[PDB]
Design a protein around this nucleic acid. Structure first.
Lengths: 132, 49, 157, 205, 173, 53, 228
RNA sequence: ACCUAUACAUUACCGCUAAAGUAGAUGAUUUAUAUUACUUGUGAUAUAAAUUUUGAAACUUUAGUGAGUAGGAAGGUACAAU
RNA sequence: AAGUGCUGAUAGAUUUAUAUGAUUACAGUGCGUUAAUUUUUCGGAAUUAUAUAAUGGCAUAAUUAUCAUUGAUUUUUGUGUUUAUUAUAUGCACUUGUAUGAUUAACAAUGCGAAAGAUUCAGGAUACCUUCGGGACCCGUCUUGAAACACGGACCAAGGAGU
């Protein structure tokens, strides 16, 4: 029910698509996570046409809306309850995700406590589990 | 000064069709008659120095 | 000699007729005292009753580079650059179909079998009456040679 | 029919130049076009016959040497001399420019309904707008016969078949207009009839 | 361009051992003002000592020939360089305007002899009345009454229909 | 650019405009051209051209 | 007093009244009325206009910053005069030939069918969605019954529920289209007076039965470059 | 006439580079009003409400600007231990 | 050359200006001398002196300095002169007014975050499949030059080299 923050901006983006590392199509050994090629006769390092595109700082997103989530909020990993008391008056820029380590026992409290401080948790319905 | 030119060139139609001059273009030139008094005061009020 | 064109071609606004800069005829008539008023012969294609027809015929390409931001159209009758200068600013639309409805009739009754990508004609392109148009998304290029509908609205007269 | 214009644009090939009619048609066929060119044995080629003899006889010695069946298949109709042109002017190695020759049917000897459907002239590619006096031209009729087309007198007799029954369908229609110009008499006192069209035409009365 | 006509006058700027140096003038056909002022020096670096700057360009003007609707036939004298071959010529054209019959020369001299226009020099241009015109293609355009029924247009190909319908039957008689 | 009609008219070839103007009216072109047999077919330019809505 | 002299808009770069305060001024005896009202005063006798702790406080909620104000500037209309026969390009009456009557302060076009003739009420269309033909239809003594204001004819309204405030709802309400009973009296007033006019015209292209057909054009004619 | 670059130009954004500004908050600043010194007039005082921290390793303002192997420097990032 | 008089379109519009510093100087509207002149009569309308150095104009003196010098061009000006032109002599309030804080905002339409329940509008080459267009040679290496008819590499996990 939580109002999105601080009269939200319009998050606009140079590339959505992520950069995918030369020849990773060709090999199962090469991970798609980018490496800069260093090798001399390489048309990707040389930036030929219709090869693919490298990273640089020029694609860097707006400094206002950098790390902002789809909801205009920014993340804050919460690990126990009294980390939510940090977000008592940051509940208007930040939002909590309960960690993966945090168990189903305590999450029920973190969800109920963070309903009082009106923060927008980004993963409730985690360890529900409408079970034991 | 371009205003009075179009004033003068619409009065070229008063050479042609002579229509009006009702509340539109004589009123553009009727003020000259009241502006004559600037020259009529020039014969009586500019003779003070 | 050419002094008359500061007189004769203002007579269109006494052929408007508003504020009459020259009440001369040039009556475009069959009178033997009338062989004037400069009618440009000719082109007479309607295909503009509404939704003037046009194909999409490629992106704003160079030779070896494409620029898919801008479409190139080919209007139904247009043949020189004064013809396609008419349509600039008209919301051209590309209309096509799809299998789904997935949606209600929400405003005036919607069936959803027909898809439209709205656009806006932007400028002229050819030296002979082709035209560019930036759309909303970007025209998938198996739409090349398929009809887009240049609208007649938003209309200057 | 109905389409981007019709679903056809029938063009007579008579008296037109082979390569200017090609680049008009290969441009129009990429617009989403549907042409259907008829009488292809009549397309005129420029230059005299022993110029174009030599050039078609050089395009047939280009055959593969390893296996000639793979090499350039040299089609010898007149309608395939012209369809060969509209493939030099079309991106035929693409799935776009292969649907652009699948609008093109091309015939030589005007058959089967393209003999009642109205066929039009392309004055940008006509001979007698383009090619000078004193300049010899050819026809693809004799070029294909002298390079081995076995159906020249086939279609010349088929032409005279449909030339012959054209005189039967004109003498149906020449007297039928003569009925209309008599049928035009009885309507001059219809009500106020013709006045509204004649005051904008009147040059045909 | 179209080769307007100028009259460009020189000076030899006046250094003290001789003031008032003696003011030569030319007749120049150039497309523009400032290229007329540099033909002048190329044609001063052959006759007088005199270069820039040792000299000036005192008043030039563009001239506007005298009778623009008379049908005079010009006869121009000419000097031109071939592939190997600097040659005199003498050519004749019919035109209403003088700078229209120097530009009539250039597009003809450049076509018929390949004559790129930096290796052509105009060395006289005058109107030549009649019965002095030699040049057979001029003096067939002399004899009033000249009948000549060359039914002529461009015959605009084709017209506003590409796929026309009407087969344009040129002769129309 | 100019197409030809069936109408000659006599001047000297060195004529000034004022005597062409004298000759242009004297042979009475102005009345017999607006009835020239396809100068009616000019006048789709004054009637079929743009033939307003 | 007087001397307005704002000649701004056909120039479009001059005003001409800096020429006024030259000799026009009294330059002396400056006495003016000079309201000095301290009436905006928290004189809480019983008045209590602090304002009190509804809040006066730091309740925290954040929305944008404030909105610099375009007002109704000039509206260019290209030359359509009442009542020119129109052609409509959108909005359930597309292709119907209608007659304008009035151009209003919202820069729009009042349009009648006549609803008797063309099944088109006194609705309201932009100049963008309409194609004005060549000449007129004469309307020299029409009253144009000026209570047909643009502001007079919103949809009235959606009160978010039935004016009671905080109420219940079921879907699919019909609260927007009677059409108005007074509007049917204004409709029969114009379409009485318009139809005495429009039959008295010389039946040209667009005067009598001549509106009543559905624009889609024909041979030898235009969308491009017409004398339309 | 017209088409055409990762060039030119005007704008948004990222970095770099170069400048410039901010830290008395038992202070500063508004809006009103009571009083007031009164200088006509504008300030000073009381009341009521309001805004006013920033890893100063920060925040704010402004302008230019971006090719790169071999190669060097900065800032991040993965791994595992104390 | 002047705005001369505009009419058309296009794309774009930073801004948490206190999330540690003018929203104010501008001009523009609405109240408080005058008098005739004019016009429409429903407004408007026009008018002088009101104080300039006056700047431009004219005449004249005057001088600095000059293309060429009959002269012209000035220069410092100064006076007289009238012909014009321009600016200054608008505080007190009050506006939803224009400007300026990288000048986008007014009007409407569409649609209800809707208790759980659940649609609308926009977007998603995320990581693929379908359809087209454009571009597009295989990496590492040595080399002047590698897609090379140069060498290594079939593929995959662990190990693996500046201490």
């Amino acid at each position: 029910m939580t109002i999105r923050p601080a009269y939200r901006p319009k998050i606009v983006k140079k590339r959505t698509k992520h950069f995918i590392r030369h020849q990773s199509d060709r090999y199962a050994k090469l991970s798609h996570k980018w490496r800069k090629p260093k090798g001399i006769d390489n048309r990707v390092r040389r930036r030929f046409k219709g090869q693919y595109l490298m990273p640089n700082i020029g694609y860097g997103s707006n400094k206002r809306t950098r790390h902002m989530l789809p909801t205009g909020f920014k993340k804050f990993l919460v690990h126990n309850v009294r980390e939510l008391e940090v977000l008592l008056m940051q509940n208007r820029v930040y939002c909590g995700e309960i960690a993966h380590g945090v168990s189903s026992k305590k999450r029920k409290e973190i969800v109920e406590r963070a309903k009082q401080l009106s923060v927008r948790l980004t993963n409730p319905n985690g360890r529900l589990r409408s079970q034991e | 000064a371009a205003e009075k030119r179009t004033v003068a060139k619409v009065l070229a139609k008063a050479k042609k069709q002579n229509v009006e001059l009702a509340k539109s273009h004589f009123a553009n030139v009727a003020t000259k008659a009241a502006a004559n008094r600037a020259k009529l005061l020039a014969a009586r009020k500019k003779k003070v120095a | 000699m050419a002094d008359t064109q500061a007189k004769s071609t203002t007579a269109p606004k006494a052929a408007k007729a508003q504020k009459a800069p020259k009440a001369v005829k040039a009556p475009k008539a069959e009178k033997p005292a009338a062989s004037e008023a400069k009618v440009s012969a000719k082109k007479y294609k309607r295909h503009g009753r509404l939704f003037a027809k046009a194909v999409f015929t490629g992106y704003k390409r160079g030779l070896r580079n494409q620029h898919e931001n801008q479409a190139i159209l080919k209007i139904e009758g247009a043949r020189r650059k004064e013809h396609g200068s008419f349509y600039v600013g008209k919301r051209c639309v590309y209309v096509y179909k799809a299998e789904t409805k997935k949606c209600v009739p929400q405003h005036p009754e919607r069936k959803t079998r027909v898809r439209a990508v709205w656009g806006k004609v932007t400028r002229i392109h050819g030296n002979t009456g082709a035209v560019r148009a930036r759309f909303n998304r970007n025209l998938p290029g198996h739409a090349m040679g398929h009809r887009i509908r240049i609208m007649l609205y938003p209309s200057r007269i | 029919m109905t389409g981007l214009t019709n679903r056809t644009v029938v063009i007579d090939g008579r008296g037109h130049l082979l390569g200017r009619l090609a680049s008009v048609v290969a441009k129009y066929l990429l617009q989403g076009g549907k042409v259907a060119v008829v009488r292809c044995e009549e397309l005129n080629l420029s230059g005299h016959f022993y110029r174009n003899k030599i050039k078609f006889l050089a395009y047939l010695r280009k055959r593969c040497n390893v296996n000639p069946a793979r090499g350039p298949f040299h089609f010898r109709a007149p309608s395939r001399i012209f369809y060969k042109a509209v493939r030099g002017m079309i991106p035929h190695k693409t799935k776009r420019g292969q649907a652009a020759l699948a609008r093109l049917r091309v015939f030589d000897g005007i058959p089967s309904p393209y003999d009642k459907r109205r066929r039009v002239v392309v004055p940008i590619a006509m001979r007698v707008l383009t090619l000078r006096s004193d300049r010899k031209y050819c026809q693809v009729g004799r070029l294909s016969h002298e390079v081995g087309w076995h159906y020249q007198d086939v279609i010349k007799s088929l032409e005279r078949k449909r030339k012959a029954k054209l005189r039967v369908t004109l003498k149906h229609n020449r007297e039928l207009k003569k009925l209309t110009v008599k049928a035009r008499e009885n309507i001059a006192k219809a009500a106020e009839p013709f006045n509204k069209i004649i005051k904008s035409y009147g040059y045909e009365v | 361009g179209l080769l307007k006509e100028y009259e460009v006058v020189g000076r030899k700027l006046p250094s003290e051992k001789e003031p008032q140096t003696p003011l030569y003038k030319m007749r120049i056909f150039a497309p523009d003002n400032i290229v007329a002022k540099s033909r002048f020096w190329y044609f001063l670096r052959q006759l007088k000592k005199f270069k820039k700057t040792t000299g000036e360009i005192v008043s030039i003007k563009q001239v506007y020939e005298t009778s623009p609707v008379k049908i005079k036939n010009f006869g121009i004298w000419l000097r031109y360089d071939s592939r190997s071959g600097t040659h005199n010529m003498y050519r004749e054209y019919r035109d209403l305007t003088v700078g229209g019959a120097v530009t009539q020369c250039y597009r003809d001299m450049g076509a018929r002899h390949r004559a790129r226009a930096h290796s052509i020099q105009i060395i006289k241009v005058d109107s030549i009345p009649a019965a002095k015109t030699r040049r057979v293609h001029v003096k067939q355009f002399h004899d009033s009454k000249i009948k000549f029924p060359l039914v002529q247009r461009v015959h605009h190909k084709g017209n506003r229909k590409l796929f026309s319908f009407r087969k344009p039957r040129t002769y129309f008689q | 650019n100019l197409h030809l009609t069936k109408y000659r008219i006599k001047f000297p070839y060195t004529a000034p405009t004022r005597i062409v103007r004298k000759a242009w009216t004297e042979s009475d072109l102005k009345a017999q051209w607006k009835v020239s047999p396809w100068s009616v077919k000019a006048q789709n330019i004054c009637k079929r051209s743009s033939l307003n809505d | 007093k007087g001397k307005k002299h704002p000649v701004n808009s056909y120039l479009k770069g001059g005003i001409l009244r800096y020429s006024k305060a030259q000799m026009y001024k009294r330059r002396a005896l400056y006495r003016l009325k000079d309201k000095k009202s301290p009436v905006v005063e928290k004189a809480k006798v019983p008045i209590k206009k602090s304002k009190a702790s509804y809040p006066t406080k730091t309740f925290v909620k954040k929305r944008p910053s404030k909105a610099n104000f375009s007002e109704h500037k000039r509206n260019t209309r290209r030359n359509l005069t009442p009542g020119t026969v129109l052609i409509l390009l959108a909005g359930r009456h597309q292709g119907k030939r209608v007659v304008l009557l009035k151009v209003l302060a919202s820069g729009l076009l009042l349009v009648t069918g006549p609803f008797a003739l063309n099944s088109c009420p006194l609705r309201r269309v932009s100049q963008r969605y309409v194609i004005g033909t060549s000449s007129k239809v004469d309307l020299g003594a029409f009253k144009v019954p000026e209570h047909l204001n643009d502001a007079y004819f919103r949809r009235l309204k959606a009160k978010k529920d039935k004016k009671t405030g905080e109420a219940d709802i079921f879907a699919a309400k019909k609260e927007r289209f009677v059409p108005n009973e007074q509007r049917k009296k204004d409709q029969k007033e114009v379409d009485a007076a318009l139809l005495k006019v429009i039959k008295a015209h010389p039946e040209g292209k667009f005067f009598a039965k001549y509106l009543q057909n559905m624009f889609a054009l024909h041979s030898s004619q235009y969308p491009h470059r017409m004398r339309f």
